[PDB]
Design an enzyme around this catalytic site. Structure first.
Site, mmCIF file in Angstrom:
data_model
loop_
_atom_site.group_PDB
_atom_site.id
_atom_site.type_symbol
_atom_site.label_atom_id
_atom_site.label_comp_id
_atom_site.label_asym_id
_atom_site.label_seq_id
_atom_site.Cartn_x
_atom_site.Cartn_y
_atom_site.Cartn_z
ATOM 1 N N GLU A 1 9.910 -1.495 -0.622
ATOM 2 C CA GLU A 1 9.947 -0.438 -1.598
ATOM 3 C C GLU A 1 9.618 0.853 -0.882
ATOM 4 O O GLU A 1 8.712 0.894 -0.064
ATOM 5 C CB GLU A 1 8.924 -0.683 -2.713
ATOM 6 C CG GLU A 1 9.122 0.205 -3.913
ATOM 7 C CD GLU A 1 8.035 0.061 -4.951
ATOM 8 O OE1 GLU A 1 7.803 -1.051 -5.456
ATOM 9 O OE2 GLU A 1 7.413 1.126 -5.245
ATOM 10 N N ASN B 1 10.836 2.607 10.587
ATOM 11 C CA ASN B 1 10.780 1.186 10.304
ATOM 12 C C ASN B 1 11.558 0.365 11.347
ATOM 13 O O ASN B 1 11.062 -0.615 11.891
ATOM 14 C CB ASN B 1 11.314 0.884 8.911
ATOM 15 C CG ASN B 1 10.247 1.014 7.862
ATOM 16 O OD1 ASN B 1 9.602 0.032 7.514
ATOM 17 N ND2 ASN B 1 10.054 2.208 7.348
#
Ligand SMILES: *[C@@H]1O[C@H](CO)[C@@H](O[C@@H]2O[C@H](CO)[C@@H](O)[C@H](O)[C@H]2NC(C)=O)[C@H](O)[C@H]1NC(C)=O
Ligand SMILES: *[C@@H]1O[C@H](CO)[C@@H](O[C@@H]2O[C@H](CO)[C@@H](O)[C@H](O)[C@H]2NC(C)=O)[C@H](O)[C@H]1NC(C)=O
Ligand code: A1IBO
Ligand code: NAG
Ligand code: K
Ligand code: K
Length: 499
Positions: free
Chosen positions: A340, A370
């Site tokens: 999320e 990420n």
């Protein structure tokens, strides 16, 4: 195929406007022939994933910035990209006319859009709901005889998911996450507030809760939907907090550890859904590496945990190396997955900023962060919201890549949509991150991956105001001479052959 129809709302860039008769779209995806590269470019100045092609050259004799692909320096395999089918997203999508609904879903899930292959599905209500409910509100139903899916699932979320799957050529993976259990399983007897499951892992309350996961998967399977993964709880830390405003269920890491080991792991493993993966944490990154240590150093919990799901509130600062980096170092065989992300949640910032290039750059910078810290996929929050950033029963409004204006039967594709698409469209499931080395200090952010078929993809983000000439070297193949304009994002793709 069809270009962006831009509109400004006074923020730093434009939205693309779609409606019942028009949306921007790509031609069916094709690769440039061997010796050619494709470049997709988006810019603050208004370009939106525009395609150009260039030659791969045998030679390079500049002395400027060189980015050398490291195709044999291999990192993580990618699961994919997508977003969340919350009640709010479903209501907003279905409030559009059928044609506009289709163009919205194609924007995300078709090859003429950005190729999403993940959908996160709340297990019953969350803040991005207008009704508070669980699937088993009838009390003391420990065998869950009265577990059932309400219309939020059967009439809104499930039909939309089926439509998304029909439009996709890439297999779509579903991820489920619960916010609250039925209140009669909770110490505080409310959907929100501080409270946890009653009793202790291994008891009736905990077994009933584990069984609710199986009942959920059973119910979705009756509708011909299967899940790739579930998380053990959305944001378990939230339910430890006095006054927590909306649906939650508090677990300490020890409680989560023991729940997984005693109840949820064994219950899933015993079920027909045993291939569904279990992701722990599903929460913000400063809980790492501690939460991973607590859960994964217990072998009875560890054997059930496939991965660690992380949330990214892009509005707020937190370290990456000390959280994700250290977790990967300690537990390299347990995948990290971003389940999320969102922006616009600060009460003092406009929830929806139509056309904010900065929020777009926050999306792509987060994705690059990420991927460079071993994370295997990235999942947005609500797939669509209204201009207020809702609906949301506690008014916890935020932004979304697609904003629906039902009074005009129109939706707006935000910079965030395109920043995400620069990754999602061009990184098939099973792609592998590979190295990319810069010859000199520079202001660019970049990541490189190799597709399952060996093709190369590189994303270059320039958050600076300066145009940066650069060269990409693929040691097997040749040189791509290009430029990273100020306030741009580019995706480069090419075929690779060896000699
Ligand atoms: C949907 O949006 C499109 C694009 O803005 C609208 O079509 C435009 O309409 C204006 C006004 O007539 C024309 O000058 C443009 O040339 C049209 N563009 C295209 C690409 O056709 C369209 O009318 C809108 N549809 C609805 C149902 O409101
Ligand atoms: C493990 O899974 C099986 C299902 O295959 C469960 O067995 C069922 O249990 C219910 C009562 O809970 C019975 O009414 C069914 O007739 C059983 N079905 C079969 C096919 O045996 C079993 O209870 C599960 N064990 C757990 C969760 O501990
Ligand atoms: C263009 C290339 C290949 C490149 C090589 C090494 C360093 C850099 C830096 N200018 C930026 N990095 C630190 S980063 O790109 O590694 C980076 C970007 C991100 F958005 C999040 C992050 F954690 C790291 C660039
Ligand atoms: C590339 O490099 C060498 C430099 O000596 C040369 O032989 C060759 O002709 C150059 N040009 C091209 C287009 O390959
Ligand atoms: K029910
Ligand atoms: K806000």
């Amino acid at each position: 195929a069809r270009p962006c129809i831009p509109k400004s709302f006074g923020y730093s860039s434009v939205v693309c406007v779609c409606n019942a008769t028009y949306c921007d779209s790509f031609d069916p995806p094709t690769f440039p022939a061997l010796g050619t590269f494709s470049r997709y470019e988006s810019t603050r100045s208004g370009r939106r994933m525009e395609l150009s092609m260039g030659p791969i050259q045998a030679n390079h004799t500049g002395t400027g910035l060189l980015l050398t692909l490291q195709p044999e320096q291999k990192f993580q395999k990618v699961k994919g990209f997508g977003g969340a089918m919350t009640d709010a997203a479903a209501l907003n999508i279905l409030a559009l006319s059928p044609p506009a609904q289709n163009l919205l879903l194609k924007s995300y899930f078709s090859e003429e859009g950005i190729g999403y292959n993940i959908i996160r599905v709340p297990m019953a209500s969350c803040d991005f709901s207008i009704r508070t409910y669980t699937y088993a509100d009838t009390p003391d139903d420990f065998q869950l005889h009265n577990f059932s899916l309400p219309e939020e699932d059967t009439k809104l979320k499930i039909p939309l998911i089926h439509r998304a799957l029909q439009l996709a050529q890439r297999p779509v993976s579903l991820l489920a996450s619960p916010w609250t259990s039925p209140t009669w399983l909770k110490t505080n007897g409310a959907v929100n507030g501080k409270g946890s499951l009653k009793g202790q892992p291994g008891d009736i309350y905990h077994q009933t809760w584990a069984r609710y996961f199986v009942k959920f998967l059973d119910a979705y399977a009756e509708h011909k939907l299967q899940f790739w993964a579930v998380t053990a709880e959305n944001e378990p830390s939230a339910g430890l907090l006095s006054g927590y405003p909306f649906q939650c269920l508090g677990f300490t890491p020890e409680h989560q550890r023991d729940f997984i080991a005693r109840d949820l792991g064994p219950t899933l493993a015993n079920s027909t859904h045993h291939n569904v993966r279990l992701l722990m944490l599903d929460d913000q990154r400063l809980l790492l590496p501690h939460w991973a240590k607590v859960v994964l150093t217990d072998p009875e919990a560890a054997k059930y945990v496939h991965g660690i799901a992380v949330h990214w509130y892009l509005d707020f600062l937190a370290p990456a190396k000390a959280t994700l980096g250290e977790t990967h170092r300690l537990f390299p065989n347990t995948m990290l997955f971003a389940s999320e992300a969102c922006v616009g949640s600060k009460f003092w910032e406009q929830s929806v900023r139509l056309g904010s290039w900065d929020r777009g750059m926050q999306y792509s910078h987060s994705i690059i962060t990420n991927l460079l810290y071993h994370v295997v996929g990235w999942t947005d929050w609500n797939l669509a919201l209204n201009p207020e950033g809702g609906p949301n029963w506690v008014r916890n409004f935020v932004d979304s890549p697609i904003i629906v204006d039902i009074t005009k039967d129109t939706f707006y594709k935000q910079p965030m949509f395109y920043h995400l698409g620069h990754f999602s469209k061009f990184i098939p499931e099973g792609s592998q991150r590979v190295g990319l080395v810069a010859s000199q200090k520079n202001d660019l952010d970049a990541v490189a991956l190799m597709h399952p078929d060996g093709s190369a993809v590189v994303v270059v983000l320039n958050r600076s105001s300066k145009d940066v000439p650069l060269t990409i070297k693929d040691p097997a193949v040749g040189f791509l001479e290009t430029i990273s304009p100020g306030y741009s994002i580019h995706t480069y793709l090419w075929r690779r052959q060896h000699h």
